[PDB]
């Protein structure tokens, strides 16, 4: 009956978690320990054959998967005032900007950087070849974000939206996990628009409090 | 006036090309001539990421990200919903459609094919990356094999933009990785996926559209 969000304290897991809480949506949260063998169990793979978090099981029992897609689903379903997103009829221009940035955040930020790094981290090391790939990918993503954020406060329209949630959660994760790594980049110096935007996004309502609930340590690097 | 699709001949680029051509949509296509054209100022104004493809709509607005362009062209030009499911009409299939477009872009392309293509140069790829790429493809194909079990198409009962997204990625995988250390033959372990790929390229004139390369002289095709 009631919707259930199965998730973990990760760059992808935290996105719909933040949105659901900002909306006070009737969504029960099942927070996995991290890492967990639960997502390899039969019952989970039935909900999400990709074997990744998060999964939202909706109020009819159907799984919705892919973090940035779940953002869209939760907004459409529970954000009745459109506080955190733009609908196609509401404002088509902004709707398409929102959609493209959710694809971009997923592919060019999360997938190209954090997911690749974590998949190739073992025993306190990421191989130099992968490490440089990831570093160059971060360089590209930050150049893009810096440009997009030029002359504005938020990614889309004139307010904090699901696009800001997607980007802020990835960036918060990067700072949480990679500050002590060979692939750290300090934004203060070369990407001032992104830094300014991050600080205002993390400061929005209770976003920071939500993210702190299951705070993680930096990855160890020899 | 007319919408314009700027592309190359790539895993992302052919997706909106295929849909547009299948719809006989009023979209002019310009293929750039390995190119640094996409670093030019006018192009960066349309797509600050400096990549292809970009669709500029009939009002001068750029739409980016291949799988998103699929959705936009479908909403805009697919009046009869031949190639997609709308949220209003079929919300259940709409969300399955949306999640698979995210999957194809992230797990198939970004996390796997893109990494493979970038790191396989001049017939060589570092062993550690090759191993990452192979394990990733094995997982993705297994997923697709599961999704396609007892089905002809990825979503609903017809060829859709999800099939377009997956087929273009698979076409590009074959075009670049066939004679390499990270080749995988689907016939061997993924027969559902092989059968689906053949069915998808055989759909209408898909195979023809995929053969299209830049015109020699003319700006548009
Ligand atoms: Cl996602
Ligand atoms: Cl895409
Ligand atoms: Cl990509």
- Sorted by where each begins, the domain ranges of chain A are 1-83+205-222, 84-204
Kindly state the tokens that stand for B94. 């709409």
Using N-to-C axis directions, what is the helix angle for B66-77 and A92-104, rounded to 10°?
A: 150
In angstroms, the CA A90 to CA B204 distance is 36
- Region B1-82+204-221: CATH code: 3.40.30.10
In angstroms, the CA B69 to CA B113 distance is 19
Between the CA of B129 and the centroid of ligand 1 the distance, in Å, is: 23
Contact B114 A119 (CB under 8 A): no
Residues in A closer than 8 angstroms to B61, CB to CB, are 93, 96
Report yes or no: A186 at the B interface, CB cutoff 8 Å: no
DSSP output for chain B: --EEEEE-SSTTTHHHHHHHHHTT-SEEEEE----SGGGSHHHHHH-TT--S-EEE-TTS-EEESHHHHHHHHHHHH-TT-SS---TTT-HHHHHHHHHHHHHIIIIIIIIIIHHHHHH-BTTB--HHHHHHHHHHHHHHHHHHHHHTTT-SSSSTTS--HHHHHHHHHHHHHHHHHTTSTT---HHHH-HHHHHHHHHHHTSTTHHHHHT----SS-S--
Closest of B34, B42, B98, B46 to residue B70, by C-alpha: B98
Kindly state the tokens that stand for A75. 């907004």
What pairs with residue B64 in β-bridges?
B54
DSSP 3-state assignment of A3? strand
**How far is residue A133 CA from its own chain's centroid?**
21
In angstroms, the CA A12 to CA A99 distance is 17
In contact, A114 and A135? CB cutoff 8 Å: no
The pairs formed by B186-195 with CB atoms below 8 angstroms and a separation of 24 or more are: B186/B141, B189/B141, B190/B141, B190/B142, B190/B144, B190/B145, B191/B145, B192/B144, B192/B145, B192/B148, B192/B149, B193/B141, B193/B144, B193/B145, B193/B148, B195/B148
In angstroms, the CA A136 to CA B116 distance is 16
Resolution (A): 1.6
In contact, B18 and B71? CB cutoff 8 Å: no
Go through chain A and tell me how many residues it has: 222
Cα atoms in the Cβ-side hemisphere of radius 13 Å centred on B114: 18
Kindly state the tokens that stand for B27. 């979209």
Sheet containing A55-57, strands listed edge to edge, beginning at the edge strand earlier in sequence = A27-31, A3-7, A55-57, A63-65
Please compute Rg for chain A using Cα positions. Answer: 17
- What letters, b where the CB count within 10 A reaches 16 and e where it falls short, cover A5-17? bbbbbbbbbbbbb
In angstroms, the CA B108 to CA B143 distance is 10
Residues in B closer than 8 angstroms to A144, CB to CB, are 48-49
In angstroms, the CA B111 to CA A106 distance is 10
Between the CA of A218 and the centroid of ligand 2 the distance, in Å, is: 30
DSSP 3-state assignment of A90? coil
In angstroms, the CA B124 to CA A168 distance is 37
In angstroms, the CA A57 to CA A60 distance is 8
Report yes or no: A96 at the B interface, CB cutoff 8 Å: yes
Residues in A closer than 8 angstroms to B49, CB to CB, are 104, 108, 140, 144
In angstroms, the CA A98 to CA A204 distance is 19
Kindly state the tokens that stand for A195. 């830094």
Class level of CATH domain A84-204 = mainly alpha
A66: closest CA of chain B, how far (Å): 6
Q: Strands, DSSP E only, in A58-178?
A: 63-65, 121-122, 125-126
CATH fold, domain B83-203, is: Glutathione S-transferase Yfyf (Class Pi); Chain A, domain 2 (1.20.1050)
In angstroms, the CA A17 to CA A30 distance is 10
In angstroms, the CA B217 to CA B33 distance is 11
In angstroms, the CA B119 to CA A221 distance is 24
DSSP 3-state assignment of A48? coil
Kindly state the tokens that stand for B99. 């999640």
The CA–CA distances, whole Å, from A178 to A53, A170, A175 equal: 20, 12, 6
Please compute Rg for chain B using Cα positions. Answer: 17
CATH fold, domain A1-83+205-222, is: Glutaredoxin (3.40.30)
Report the residue of A12, A62, A98, A107 to disrupt the B interface, i.e. the one with the largest count of B CBs within 10 Å.
A107
In contact, A161 and A71? CB cutoff 8 Å: no
In angstroms, the CA A116 to CA B213 distance is 32
Report yes or no: A66 at the B interface, CB cutoff 8 Å: yes
DSSP assignment, residue A8? Answer: -
CB neighbours of residue A61 within 10 Å: 10
To which residue do tokens 């719909």 refer?
A: A16
**How far is residue B200 CA from its own chain's centroid?**
12
Closest of A47, A43, A40 to residue A62, by C-alpha: A47
In angstroms, the CA B167 to CA B15 distance is 9
To which residue do tokens 């700027």 refer?
A: B6
In angstroms, the CA B95 to CA A50 distance is 16
Helix (H) or strand (E) holding A5: strand A3-7
Report yes or no: B128 at the A interface, CB cutoff 8 Å: yes
In angstroms, the CA A138 to CA A109 distance is 7
């Amino acid at each position: 009956v009631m919707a259930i969000l199965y998730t973990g304290p990760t760059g992808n897991g935290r996105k719909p978690l933040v949105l659901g809480k900002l909306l006070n949506a009737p969504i029960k949260v099942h927070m996995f320990h991290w890492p967990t063998k639960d997502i390899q169990e039969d019952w989970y793979l039935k909900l999400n054959p990709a074997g990744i978090v998060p999964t939202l099981v909706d109020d009819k029992g159907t799984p919705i998967t892919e973090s940035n897609n779940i953002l869209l689903y939760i907004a459409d379903t529970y954000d009745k005032e459109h506080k955190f997103f733009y609908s196609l009829k509401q404002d088509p221009k902004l709707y398409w900007e929102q959609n493209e940035l959710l694809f971009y955040q997923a592919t060019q930020f999360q997938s190209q950087t954090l997911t690749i790094a974590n998949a190739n981290y073992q025993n306190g090391h990421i191989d130099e070849n992968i490490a440089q790939y990831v570093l160059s990918s971060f360089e590209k993503v930050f150049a893009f974000m810096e440009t997009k954020l030029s002359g504005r406060d938020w990614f889309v329209g004139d307010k904090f939206t699901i696009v800001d949630i997607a980007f802020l959660v990835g960036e918060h994760r990067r700072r949480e996990r990679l500050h002590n790594s060979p692939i750290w980049i300090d934004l203060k110096e070369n990407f001032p628009n992104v830094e300014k935007w991050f600080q205002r996004a993390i400061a929005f309502e209770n976003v920071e409090e939500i993210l702190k609930e299951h705070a993680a340590e930096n990855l160890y690097f020899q």
